Amino acid sequence: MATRTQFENSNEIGVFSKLTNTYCLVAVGGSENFYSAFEAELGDAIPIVHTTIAGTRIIGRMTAGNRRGLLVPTQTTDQELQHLRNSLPDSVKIQRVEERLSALGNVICCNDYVALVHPDIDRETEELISDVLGVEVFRQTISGNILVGSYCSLSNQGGLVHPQTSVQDQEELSSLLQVPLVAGTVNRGSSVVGAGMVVNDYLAVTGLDTTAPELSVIESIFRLQ
Amino acid sequence: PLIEEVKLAVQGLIDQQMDWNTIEKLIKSEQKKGNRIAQLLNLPLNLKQNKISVKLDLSSNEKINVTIDLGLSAYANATEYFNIKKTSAQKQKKVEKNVGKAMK
Amino acid sequence: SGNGAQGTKFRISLGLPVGAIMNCADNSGARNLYIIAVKGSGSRLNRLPAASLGDMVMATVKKGKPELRKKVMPAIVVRQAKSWRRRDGVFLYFEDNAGVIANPKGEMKGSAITGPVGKECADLWPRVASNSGVVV
Amino acid sequence: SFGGINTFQQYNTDLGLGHNGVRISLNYFDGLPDPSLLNSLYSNELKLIFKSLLKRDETTKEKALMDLSNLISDFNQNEYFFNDIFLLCWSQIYAKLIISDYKVIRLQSHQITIMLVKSLRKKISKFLKDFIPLILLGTCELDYSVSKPSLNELTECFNKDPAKINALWAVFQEQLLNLVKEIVVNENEDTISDERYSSKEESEFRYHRVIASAVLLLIKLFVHNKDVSERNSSSLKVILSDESIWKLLNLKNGQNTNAYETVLRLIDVLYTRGYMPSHKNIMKLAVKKLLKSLTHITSKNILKVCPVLPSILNLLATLDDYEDGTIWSYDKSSKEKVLKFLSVSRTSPSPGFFNAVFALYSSTKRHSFLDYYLEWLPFWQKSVQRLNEKGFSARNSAEVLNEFWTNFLKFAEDSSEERVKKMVESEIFNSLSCGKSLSEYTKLNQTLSGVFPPDKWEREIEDYFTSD
Amino acid sequence: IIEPSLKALASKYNCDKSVCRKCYARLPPRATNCRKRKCGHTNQLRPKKKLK
RNA sequence: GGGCGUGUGGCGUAGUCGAGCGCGCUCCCUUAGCAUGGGAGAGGUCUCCGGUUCGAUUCCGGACUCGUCCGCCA
RNA sequence: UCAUCUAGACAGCCGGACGGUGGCCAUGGAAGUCGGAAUCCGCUAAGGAGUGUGUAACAACUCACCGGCCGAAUGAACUAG
Ligand SMILES: [Mg+2]
Ligand SMILES: [Zn+2]
């Protein structure tokens, strides 16, 4: 399933949510339908944490997540950090990042094995990503889009990239990430695919205005069947 | 009477508040499955003006297409067709009164 | 703001009246935006309609590309440079006035934002938070 | 509250899936619950749940299902609510719901029906004939998430008795077949999904997913019931004759080869049963379509279609055995298609591909389908060369190379010619020498145990030390 | 659909009235003059406009 | 703003209730040039929309459009 | 100014509200009720060649007329303080 969901009318689910294999994060100011989608589809096996990052309802663009670790900005308060430490399982590691770009979901596009980052990140932050997430890192842009997290949706099975992407960039990124990539649109043609939707190994959640060919492209590239 | 049966059928489908295109698809499927009441109907339905159209045999294999209002009886639709006949005759008489002075 | 607001906004000290020229932060090829109107502003005799951070305004491109000049379009203020107070009581300000171009529904005409944006704007507009590099 | 009469339905007198006097059908236009029955429901709450299920929007449908489930969960208080009237209405709606695009709708509907059976056991007997086939179709749905929970629940409903589950397949087999016929023959893509709200594609995609489930069910039915072919021959023929099952065998377009694979399994099962041999026309139609599929595989889609290729070749080998390679004879250009298929297939190798190729050779050699020297060898040689250059760069390469060697070695044995022997030695040396790290992968070296006499290999080691 | 008898009972209070042409007052169906002072108890009344 | 009139072919313009000519150019022929002329061409929703009539450019009503004329203060 | 009125008036209930005759023209039909004319008898306590609803035309319902209950004034149109 690519599950049709709105955040109070918003068809961008990746902005307000962060979904990994092991956990899920949702914003505190959410509707009953928005919570019920993650509660029904994810089930009781996977914890869902209602969280606020840096005083903001936006959490997907603020944080970058992995099954092994979670990265939070510097502006995240101690109460939010302690609540995430209690609510999250003991396996994941939560570490604050002290870096100027500070919006880790926009900066970092990552999965379990390999990650794409903004080219201009600091070397200490790159080593921190490689340490906490245990993930090999490449500094690359998707056809000149420096915000790889906003302009790519990535999982273990496959990836969706920006629609206006050069084909040569598509095989280059596909060989670099060792996963097949498809250029496509989400939410009735919105270009920002990573902000448009969240995905993991068995679930994808998207906006209600995402059309049927777009949803078919999603389930084909992410192998959710 | 068979026109009244067709009208009762279409009105029963209308009174279920069913979508008009789904009603037309139901007519097509029952025509494919050989329902006589469905096969008497012509598919471009004018439900916006509450009007259907029905095929009647000219000889008791050629068929004619006649429009029937759903809000009037079949006999009342026949009287309307008779009325359009009667109005046409009076215009023809007016033309016959016109002809001599007009052509002069 | 008005239609495309995702939630409400606390009152930010108004810093951009009508006639203000702010930098154009996105990559749409426009250089500055000239504010002619503020969405949702009230009516008072002689009072100029002023804008704050996170507000949607009506603006014209005074300097930039000729297909963007000489027409009115909606814009969103992302940097204010007039100091305002949050409910945790820090007084903060950027060093320039800056906004981005959008449609009336709020999605950006451009694709990337240079420089910081305010969290009071990023929370209120998700597309701005999507294309934003750093949110403070 | 509910108004109108289904007058058109009365004339038809076809109950489709239903055997209790209510038409149950997959198509959106018909099989909708009759207004009069809907009014007859015991409580107002139930009636509202039914209106919501009728509405198109999913959030509304889901909310209604959630409510219905809650009512069923509190069975003791609500037992009066669920009556024959409820069951007749549910049966009509359930059919439409199981074909729903949204998985949650599908899963919830299945869960609800199972709960009803457990709670109302022995009173749903009248309705078991309607409900059981549909429940099973869900348990044989390609998506794992819908199928696995549904099966687990069904087993639990029957007190975890394997025999009962098997019995169900036997008892309602005629009905199960009727469901398959209805999806395959009676339905069309348009009938299943509304045109206004769907594109030409998607409608096709949906039909294909549903039909695939039907085929999987058919395969299961055949395995479970030994005598199914004899008792239901007429029904089986109509389902098989229709091209809809066969249209699934297209690799040019489509998200997955999983559906295509299911069709291949059906053809194989039918051959094992002997139904395909028994009925020539069905077999010929299937065979020709399979040959066409071989052409569809192309360089652009080779990566996508690679897992299915070993299976395709294996089926072909089995079919060839029938009628002394009669399958090739059916199509004039079949040999050309095979040659083309082989050329495209060799470029990308998948695990088990080589064994399939050898199996095809083994079946074909008696009837001389491929020239051993002019045609086959070139295929083999090119293959090793390709394998070496991209070697051992991929993971399972060790297994793939091992396979090539085992297979090629067998092929070579049936030559009695110098060129083949020469090729084997030269290629082996090249494969080991350019290599990569063949020795280093112990498993690779073990799997590729040897290619020549032991003493000579030692002499070559001697040359390497002796070399400049 | 409500019910035929229940539609009759609800329409007895909602639809089977008369309307004064001068002051738009909702009046009894068998009334002869408007009960309001502002129109001067006029006898210009019309039936309330039904559907269908 | 109002009043008063107005509206025809690609262009110009004639019409009593029973759409025509010229020009432009469609073609062909004509010719010592300082290249003409002849014969057949097409062409309108009569500004538009209603009503009367049997039919309205032709009568009338409405709308549209253009041209005119007359108009604020200290 | 017209009418009705203890020989039973006007409101309210209840019952009948009929035959010649589907009166004559005209219509594919129109039988009281699309129209054109005439508009008369019988039985009556009383019932129109019809007041509406009403159907293709019927059928059906209701009327204005007469009757039981009521027992005494009432209805229409108009004028002006
Ligand atoms: Mg002023
Ligand atoms: Zn009044």
mmCIF file with all atom_site columns, N, CA and C in Angstrom, chain A residues 27-76:
data_model
loop_
_atom_site.group_PDB
_atom_site.id
_atom_site.type_symbol
_atom_site.label_atom_id
_atom_site.label_alt_id
_atom_site.label_comp_id
_atom_site.label_asym_id
_atom_site.label_entity_id
_atom_site.label_seq_id
_atom_site.pdbx_PDB_ins_code
_atom_site.Cartn_x
_atom_site.Cartn_y
_atom_site.Cartn_z
_atom_site.occupancy
_atom_site.B_iso_or_equiv
_atom_site.pdbx_formal_charge
_atom_site.auth_seq_id
_atom_site.auth_comp_id
_atom_site.auth_asym_id
_atom_site.auth_atom_id
_atom_site.pdbx_PDB_model_num
ATOM 1   N N  . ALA A 1 27 ? 3.926  14.029 14.041 1.00 0.00 ? 27 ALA A N  1
ATOM 2   C CA . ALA A 1 27 ? 3.806  15.317 14.709 1.00 0.00 ? 27 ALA A CA 1
ATOM 3   C C  . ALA A 1 27 ? 2.708  15.284 15.766 1.00 0.00 ? 27 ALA A C  1
ATOM 4   N N  . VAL A 1 28 ? 2.851  16.137 16.785 1.00 0.00 ? 28 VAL A N  1
ATOM 5   C CA . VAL A 1 28 ? 1.911  16.122 17.905 1.00 0.00 ? 28 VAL A CA 1
ATOM 6   C C  . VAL A 1 28 ? 0.573  16.734 17.507 1.00 0.00 ? 28 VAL A C  1
ATOM 7   N N  . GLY A 1 29 ? 0.579  17.678 16.570 1.00 0.00 ? 29 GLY A N  1
ATOM 8   C CA . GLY A 1 29 ? -0.652 18.343 16.199 1.00 0.00 ? 29 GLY A CA 1
ATOM 9   C C  . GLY A 1 29 ? -1.352 17.687 15.028 1.00 0.00 ? 29 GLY A C  1
ATOM 10  N N  . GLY A 1 30 ? -1.708 16.411 15.172 1.00 0.00 ? 30 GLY A N  1
ATOM 11  C CA . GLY A 1 30 ? -2.191 15.634 14.055 1.00 0.00 ? 30 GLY A CA 1
ATOM 12  C C  . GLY A 1 30 ? -3.621 15.176 14.255 1.00 0.00 ? 30 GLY A C  1
ATOM 13  N N  . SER A 1 31 ? -4.258 14.851 13.136 1.00 0.00 ? 31 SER A N  1
ATOM 14  C CA . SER A 1 31 ? -5.649 14.434 13.150 1.00 0.00 ? 31 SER A CA 1
ATOM 15  C C  . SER A 1 31 ? -5.774 12.941 13.449 1.00 0.00 ? 31 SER A C  1
ATOM 16  N N  . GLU A 1 32 ? -7.011 12.546 13.774 1.00 0.00 ? 32 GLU A N  1
ATOM 17  C CA . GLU A 1 32 ? -7.306 11.159 14.117 1.00 0.00 ? 32 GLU A CA 1
ATOM 18  C C  . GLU A 1 32 ? -7.092 10.231 12.930 1.00 0.00 ? 32 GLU A C  1
ATOM 19  N N  . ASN A 1 33 ? -7.447 10.681 11.723 1.00 0.00 ? 33 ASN A N  1
ATOM 20  C CA . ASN A 1 33 ? -7.211 9.882  10.522 1.00 0.00 ? 33 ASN A CA 1
ATOM 21  C C  . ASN A 1 33 ? -5.720 9.713  10.253 1.00 0.00 ? 33 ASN A C  1
ATOM 22  N N  . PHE A 1 34 ? -4.951 10.790 10.448 1.00 0.00 ? 34 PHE A N  1
ATOM 23  C CA . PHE A 1 34 ? -3.508 10.753 10.221 1.00 0.00 ? 34 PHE A CA 1
ATOM 24  C C  . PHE A 1 34 ? -2.819 9.805  11.193 1.00 0.00 ? 34 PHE A C  1
ATOM 25  N N  . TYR A 1 35 ? -3.246 9.800  12.456 1.00 0.00 ? 35 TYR A N  1
ATOM 26  C CA . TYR A 1 35 ? -2.685 8.830  13.393 1.00 0.00 ? 35 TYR A CA 1
ATOM 27  C C  . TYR A 1 35 ? -3.192 7.421  13.114 1.00 0.00 ? 35 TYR A C  1
ATOM 28  N N  . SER A 1 36 ? -4.449 7.298  12.675 1.00 0.00 ? 36 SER A N  1
ATOM 29  C CA . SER A 1 36 ? -5.065 5.990  12.496 1.00 0.00 ? 36 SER A CA 1
ATOM 30  C C  . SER A 1 36 ? -4.459 5.247  11.319 1.00 0.00 ? 36 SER A C  1
ATOM 31  N N  . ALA A 1 37 ? -3.986 5.984  10.308 1.00 0.00 ? 37 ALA A N  1
ATOM 32  C CA . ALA A 1 37 ? -3.301 5.353  9.182  1.00 0.00 ? 37 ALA A CA 1
ATOM 33  C C  . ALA A 1 37 ? -2.026 4.646  9.632  1.00 0.00 ? 37 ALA A C  1
ATOM 34  N N  . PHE A 1 38 ? -1.187 5.336  10.400 1.00 0.00 ? 38 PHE A N  1
ATOM 35  C CA . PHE A 1 38 ? 0.044  4.712  10.871 1.00 0.00 ? 38 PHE A CA 1
ATOM 36  C C  . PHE A 1 38 ? -0.241 3.625  11.901 1.00 0.00 ? 38 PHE A C  1
ATOM 37  N N  . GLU A 1 39 ? -1.278 3.807  12.722 1.00 0.00 ? 39 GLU A N  1
ATOM 38  C CA . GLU A 1 39 ? -1.603 2.804  13.734 1.00 0.00 ? 39 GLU A CA 1
ATOM 39  C C  . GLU A 1 39 ? -2.147 1.521  13.110 1.00 0.00 ? 39 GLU A C  1
ATOM 40  N N  . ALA A 1 40 ? -2.985 1.640  12.078 1.00 0.00 ? 40 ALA A N  1
ATOM 41  C CA . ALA A 1 40 ? -3.529 0.452  11.429 1.00 0.00 ? 40 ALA A CA 1
ATOM 42  C C  . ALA A 1 40 ? -2.486 -0.236 10.555 1.00 0.00 ? 40 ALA A C  1
ATOM 43  N N  . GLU A 1 41 ? -1.762 0.532  9.735  1.00 0.00 ? 41 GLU A N  1
ATOM 44  C CA . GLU A 1 41 ? -0.828 -0.070 8.790  1.00 0.00 ? 41 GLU A CA 1
ATOM 45  C C  . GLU A 1 41 ? 0.427  -0.598 9.477  1.00 0.00 ? 41 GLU A C  1
ATOM 46  N N  . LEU A 1 42 ? 0.979  0.159  10.429 1.00 0.00 ? 42 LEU A N  1
ATOM 47  C CA . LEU A 1 42 ? 2.211  -0.272 11.080 1.00 0.00 ? 42 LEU A CA 1
ATOM 48  C C  . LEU A 1 42 ? 1.956  -1.381 12.092 1.00 0.00 ? 42 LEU A C  1
ATOM 49  N N  . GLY A 1 43 ? 0.832  -1.324 12.793 1.00 0.00 ? 43 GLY A N  1
ATOM 50  C CA . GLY A 1 43 ? 0.543  -2.320 13.803 1.00 0.00 ? 43 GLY A CA 1
ATOM 51  C C  . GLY A 1 43 ? 1.283  -2.051 15.102 1.00 0.00 ? 43 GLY A C  1
ATOM 52  N N  . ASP A 1 44 ? 1.207  -3.026 16.004 1.00 0.00 ? 44 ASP A N  1
ATOM 53  C CA . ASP A 1 44 ? 1.811  -2.913 17.326 1.00 0.00 ? 44 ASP A CA 1
ATOM 54  C C  . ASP A 1 44 ? 3.270  -3.345 17.358 1.00 0.00 ? 44 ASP A C  1
ATOM 55  N N  . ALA A 1 45 ? 3.789  -3.901 16.262 1.00 0.00 ? 45 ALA A N  1
ATOM 56  C CA . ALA A 1 45 ? 5.177  -4.355 16.244 1.00 0.00 ? 45 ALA A CA 1
ATOM 57  C C  . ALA A 1 45 ? 6.147  -3.180 16.223 1.00 0.00 ? 45 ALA A C  1
ATOM 58  N N  . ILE A 1 46 ? 5.739  -2.063 15.629 1.00 0.00 ? 46 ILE A N  1
ATOM 59  C CA . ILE A 1 46 ? 6.615  -0.932 15.362 1.00 0.00 ? 46 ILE A CA 1
ATOM 60  C C  . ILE A 1 46 ? 6.130  0.255  16.182 1.00 0.00 ? 46 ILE A C  1
ATOM 61  N N  . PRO A 1 47 ? 6.970  0.844  17.033 1.00 0.00 ? 47 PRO A N  1
ATOM 62  C CA . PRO A 1 47 ? 6.525  1.984  17.844 1.00 0.00 ? 47 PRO A CA 1
ATOM 63  C C  . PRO A 1 47 ? 6.315  3.236  17.004 1.00 0.00 ? 47 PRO A C  1
ATOM 64  N N  . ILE A 1 48 ? 5.259  3.972  17.336 1.00 0.00 ? 48 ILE A N  1
ATOM 65  C CA . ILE A 1 48 ? 4.956  5.266  16.738 1.00 0.00 ? 48 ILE A CA 1
ATOM 66  C C  . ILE A 1 48 ? 5.070  6.306  17.840 1.00 0.00 ? 48 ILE A C  1
ATOM 67  N N  . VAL A 1 49 ? 5.933  7.296  17.637 1.00 0.00 ? 49 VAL A N  1
ATOM 68  C CA . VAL A 1 49 ? 6.230  8.295  18.652 1.00 0.00 ? 49 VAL A CA 1
ATOM 69  C C  . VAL A 1 49 ? 5.693  9.639  18.187 1.00 0.00 ? 49 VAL A C  1
ATOM 70  N N  . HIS A 1 50 ? 4.829  10.241 18.997 1.00 0.00 ? 50 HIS A N  1
ATOM 71  C CA . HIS A 1 50 ? 4.384  11.605 18.756 1.00 0.00 ? 50 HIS A CA 1
ATOM 72  C C  . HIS A 1 50 ? 5.446  12.548 19.301 1.00 0.00 ? 50 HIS A C  1
ATOM 73  N N  . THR A 1 51 ? 6.096  13.293 18.416 1.00 0.00 ? 51 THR A N  1
ATOM 74  C CA . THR A 1 51 ? 7.270  14.056 18.800 1.00 0.00 ? 51 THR A CA 1
ATOM 75  C C  . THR A 1 51 ? 7.226  15.447 18.194 1.00 0.00 ? 51 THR A C  1
ATOM 76  N N  . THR A 1 52 ? 7.973  16.343 18.826 1.00 0.00 ? 52 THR A N  1
ATOM 77  C CA . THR A 1 52 ? 8.218  17.687 18.333 1.00 0.00 ? 52 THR A CA 1
ATOM 78  C C  . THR A 1 52 ? 9.724  17.873 18.265 1.00 0.00 ? 52 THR A C  1
ATOM 79  N N  . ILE A 1 53 ? 10.217 18.396 17.150 1.00 0.00 ? 53 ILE A N  1
ATOM 80  C CA . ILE A 1 53 ? 11.643 18.638 16.967 1.00 0.00 ? 53 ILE A CA 1
ATOM 81  C C  . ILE A 1 53 ? 11.855 20.139 16.868 1.00 0.00 ? 53 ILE A C  1
ATOM 82  N N  . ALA A 1 54 ? 12.664 20.673 17.793 1.00 0.00 ? 54 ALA A N  1
ATOM 83  C CA . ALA A 1 54 ? 13.038 22.091 17.874 1.00 0.00 ? 54 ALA A CA 1
ATOM 84  C C  . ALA A 1 54 ? 11.824 23.008 17.983 1.00 0.00 ? 54 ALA A C  1
ATOM 85  N N  . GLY A 1 55 ? 10.776 22.546 18.657 1.00 0.00 ? 55 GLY A N  1
ATOM 86  C CA . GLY A 1 55 ? 9.570  23.332 18.777 1.00 0.00 ? 55 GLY A CA 1
ATOM 87  C C  . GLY A 1 55 ? 8.727  23.401 17.525 1.00 0.00 ? 55 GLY A C  1
ATOM 88  N N  . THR A 1 56 ? 8.980  22.543 16.543 1.00 0.00 ? 56 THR A N  1
ATOM 89  C CA . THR A 1 56 ? 8.323  22.610 15.248 1.00 0.00 ? 56 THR A CA 1
ATOM 90  C C  . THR A 1 56 ? 7.512  21.349 14.994 1.00 0.00 ? 56 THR A C  1
ATOM 91  N N  . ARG A 1 57 ? 6.356  21.519 14.348 1.00 0.00 ? 57 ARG A N  1
ATOM 92  C CA . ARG A 1 57 ? 5.562  20.369 13.930 1.00 0.00 ? 57 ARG A CA 1
ATOM 93  C C  . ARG A 1 57 ? 6.256  19.598 12.816 1.00 0.00 ? 57 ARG A C  1
ATOM 94  N N  . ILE A 1 58 ? 7.039  20.292 11.991 1.00 0.00 ? 58 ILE A N  1
ATOM 95  C CA . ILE A 1 58 ? 7.800  19.623 10.944 1.00 0.00 ? 58 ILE A CA 1
ATOM 96  C C  . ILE A 1 58 ? 8.924  18.816 11.588 1.00 0.00 ? 58 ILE A C  1
ATOM 97  N N  . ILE A 1 59 ? 8.938  17.512 11.323 1.00 0.00 ? 59 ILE A N  1
ATOM 98  C CA . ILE A 1 59 ? 9.917  16.638 11.962 1.00 0.00 ? 59 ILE A CA 1
ATOM 99  C C  . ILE A 1 59 ? 10.680 15.841 10.912 1.00 0.00 ? 59 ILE A C  1
ATOM 100 N N  . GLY A 1 60 ? 10.024 15.570 9.782  1.00 0.00 ? 60 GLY A N  1
ATOM 101 C CA . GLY A 1 60 ? 10.659 14.791 8.735  1.00 0.00 ? 60 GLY A CA 1
ATOM 102 C C  . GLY A 1 60 ? 11.777 15.545 8.051  1.00 0.00 ? 60 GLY A C  1
ATOM 103 N N  . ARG A 1 61 ? 11.594 16.851 7.864  1.00 0.00 ? 61 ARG A N  1
ATOM 104 C CA . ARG A 1 61 ? 12.625 17.677 7.252  1.00 0.00 ? 61 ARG A CA 1
ATOM 105 C C  . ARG A 1 61 ? 13.675 18.102 8.268  1.00 0.00 ? 61 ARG A C  1
ATOM 106 N N  . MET A 1 62 ? 13.352 18.013 9.556  1.00 0.00 ? 62 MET A N  1
ATOM 107 C CA . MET A 1 62 ? 14.323 18.392 10.575 1.00 0.00 ? 62 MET A CA 1
ATOM 108 C C  . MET A 1 62 ? 15.244 17.236 10.937 1.00 0.00 ? 62 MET A C  1
ATOM 109 N N  . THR A 1 63 ? 14.757 16.000 10.861 1.00 0.00 ? 63 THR A N  1
ATOM 110 C CA . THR A 1 63 ? 15.533 14.849 11.304 1.00 0.00 ? 63 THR A CA 1
ATOM 111 C C  . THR A 1 63 ? 15.803 13.883 10.159 1.00 0.00 ? 63 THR A C  1
ATOM 112 N N  . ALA A 1 64 ? 16.920 13.165 10.270 1.00 0.00 ? 64 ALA A N  1
ATOM 113 C CA . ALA A 1 64 ? 17.283 12.092 9.353  1.00 0.00 ? 64 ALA A CA 1
ATOM 114 C C  . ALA A 1 64 ? 17.395 10.798 10.144 1.00 0.00 ? 64 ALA A C  1
ATOM 115 N N  . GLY A 1 65 ? 16.712 9.753  9.677  1.00 0.00 ? 65 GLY A N  1
ATOM 116 C CA . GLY A 1 65 ? 16.534 8.558  10.469 1.00 0.00 ? 65 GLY A CA 1
ATOM 117 C C  . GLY A 1 65 ? 17.029 7.309  9.766  1.00 0.00 ? 65 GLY A C  1
ATOM 118 N N  . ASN A 1 66 ? 17.364 6.317  10.588 1.00 0.00 ? 66 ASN A N  1
ATOM 119 C CA . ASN A 1 66 ? 17.844 5.017  10.148 1.00 0.00 ? 66 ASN A CA 1
ATOM 120 C C  . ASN A 1 66 ? 17.355 3.985  11.155 1.00 0.00 ? 66 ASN A C  1
ATOM 121 N N  . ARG A 1 67 ? 17.409 2.704  10.775 1.00 0.00 ? 67 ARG A N  1
ATOM 122 C CA . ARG A 1 67 ? 17.074 1.645  11.723 1.00 0.00 ? 67 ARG A CA 1
ATOM 123 C C  . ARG A 1 67 ? 18.099 1.561  12.851 1.00 0.00 ? 67 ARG A C  1
ATOM 124 N N  . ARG A 1 68 ? 19.342 1.970  12.587 1.00 0.00 ? 68 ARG A N  1
ATOM 125 C CA . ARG A 1 68 ? 20.372 1.911  13.617 1.00 0.00 ? 68 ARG A CA 1
ATOM 126 C C  . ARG A 1 68 ? 20.447 3.206  14.417 1.00 0.00 ? 68 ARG A C  1
ATOM 127 N N  . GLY A 1 69 ? 20.056 4.328  13.819 1.00 0.00 ? 69 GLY A N  1
ATOM 128 C CA . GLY A 1 69 ? 20.251 5.590  14.510 1.00 0.00 ? 69 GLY A CA 1
ATOM 129 C C  . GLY A 1 69 ? 19.342 6.690  14.017 1.00 0.00 ? 69 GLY A C  1
ATOM 130 N N  . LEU A 1 70 ? 19.231 7.722  14.850 1.00 0.00 ? 70 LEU A N  1
ATOM 131 C CA . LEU A 1 70 ? 18.443 8.912  14.566 1.00 0.00 ? 70 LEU A CA 1
ATOM 132 C C  . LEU A 1 70 ? 19.297 10.146 14.810 1.00 0.00 ? 70 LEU A C  1
ATOM 133 N N  . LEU A 1 71 ? 19.202 11.116 13.906 1.00 0.00 ? 71 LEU A N  1
ATOM 134 C CA . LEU A 1 71 ? 19.956 12.357 13.999 1.00 0.00 ? 71 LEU A CA 1
ATOM 135 C C  . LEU A 1 71 ? 18.997 13.519 14.209 1.00 0.00 ? 71 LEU A C  1
ATOM 136 N N  . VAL A 1 72 ? 19.298 14.364 15.190 1.00 0.00 ? 72 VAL A N  1
ATOM 137 C CA . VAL A 1 72 ? 18.433 15.485 15.542 1.00 0.00 ? 72 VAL A CA 1
ATOM 138 C C  . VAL A 1 72 ? 19.246 16.774 15.491 1.00 0.00 ? 72 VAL A C  1
ATOM 139 N N  . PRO A 1 73 ? 18.631 17.917 15.191 1.00 0.00 ? 73 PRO A N  1
ATOM 140 C CA . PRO A 1 73 ? 19.382 19.176 15.169 1.00 0.00 ? 73 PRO A CA 1
ATOM 141 C C  . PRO A 1 73 ? 19.750 19.655 16.565 1.00 0.00 ? 73 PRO A C  1
ATOM 142 N N  . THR A 1 74 ? 20.584 20.699 16.587 1.00 0.00 ? 74 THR A N  1
ATOM 143 C CA . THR A 1 74 ? 21.071 21.264 17.842 1.00 0.00 ? 74 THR A CA 1
ATOM 144 C C  . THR A 1 74 ? 19.941 21.911 18.631 1.00 0.00 ? 74 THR A C  1
ATOM 145 N N  . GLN A 1 75 ? 18.964 22.484 17.928 1.00 0.00 ? 75 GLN A N  1
ATOM 146 C CA . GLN A 1 75 ? 17.897 23.236 18.578 1.00 0.00 ? 75 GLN A CA 1
ATOM 147 C C  . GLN A 1 75 ? 16.889 22.344 19.295 1.00 0.00 ? 75 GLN A C  1
ATOM 148 N N  . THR A 1 76 ? 16.999 21.021 19.159 1.00 0.00 ? 76 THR A N  1
ATOM 149 C CA . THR A 1 76 ? 16.123 20.103 19.879 1.00 0.00 ? 76 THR A CA 1
ATOM 150 C C  . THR A 1 76 ? 16.360 20.205 21.381 1.00 0.00 ? 76 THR A C  1
#
